[PDB]
Amino acid sequence: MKQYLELMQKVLDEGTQKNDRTGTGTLSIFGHQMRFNLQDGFPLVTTKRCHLRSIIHELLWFLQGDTNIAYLHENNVTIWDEWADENGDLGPVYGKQWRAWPTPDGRHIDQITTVLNQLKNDPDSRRIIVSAWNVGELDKMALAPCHAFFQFYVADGKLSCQLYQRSCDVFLGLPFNIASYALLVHMMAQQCDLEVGDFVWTGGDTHLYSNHMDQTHLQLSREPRPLPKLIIKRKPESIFDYRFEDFEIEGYDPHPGIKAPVAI
Template sequence: MKEYLELVNYVLENGELKKNRTGTDTLSCFAYFYRINLAEGYPLLTTKKIFFNSMLYELFWYLSGDEHIKGLREHTKIWDAWADEEGRLETAYGRFWRRYPVPENGLPGENWGKKWISRDDASGGLVFDQIQYIIDTLKEIKVNPETPNLRRMIVTAWHPGNAAESKLPPCHYTFCLNVTGNKLNCHLTQRSADIALG
């Protein structure tokens, strides 16, 4: 919580007032960084009411790979404004986490993790399951701490072609995992953060 309050204070003191596409001016700072040690507890905000179950359902929705918000609407309506008429969210995090599009024939000179590539039921194209790759790599690390994939555990929700035109490109667009001293570490990168929301 202390780290979050320091971020809020930093933005209030150093933020630059900017116009944005929503018509609501923002205070903006670039590339702020802070650490949270989860061994010391979960960093749940105490400055406002947090609906923990809604947060969990949203995380489960991400992990499911679903791009439709119909099942999520029972627990939170935060995504309603960004979905299309059918309830589809074009930049759903889970969609790219679980079904990141890959070229049909690959690219010359590149290797692809075929174990995690499948044919997508919705689009018919080939997709890469980044979350399953992470799970399998973590299992491999547990058996062999010297596994060569130790520094390749990166998940991205950013697709440049999609983000260039979408209503709401992913905010927390990538995270990198690392196991050091038998502890799992995560480095999360965001392009934008509505810090008033937490």
């Protein structure tokens, strides 16, 4: 995508070399914002094939509050395997905090349901927020949430969403992170009878790993294609009732897939 390649180019031109947790080494910039009007098309990267099965199943898995990888395996998705313990557990990551953030006084808070209530009863509210950054539980997590905090916004009958992502692996993560949230926006707007508006991505430490340099130069030589169209076939009873096959991505014609090593 246009915005995606401009970002890739910017890290190459303007990033400073940095050490990082993994030992891999990176080129990194700090702070960047991109806007996607979800009306122009579904923001799925076309300059390499992205694995939709994985993107979609992760989202469904988040919406369940499942933090164990068994559901991913039943569905042949292995993108979380490097970080699970032998029981296949990741600790109270994403979905646990979305569905059941633990309070100090014993309760559990379902932010997703909270958010549908706000969008159904108080669309102008400026507090329509989901956070994964539960400070009290970071140390139980296999990995701190990279996509940490997001806000919904309604104006003129359209649903918008902004994501704060503290740490972005531009080559491997960002293409999923974008498709994934764009999906949630479509699902949420459907549930709430809204049009889709913009998805705004905001990054903190936005980086390209040092052993993604040939892959990056390869993808930047590619010309982007027309964006696909997302079709949801059925309107489920609830945001928690989507099935993988309710989604149709039509007109998706990427350049070939490009393999790159994961930073563990």
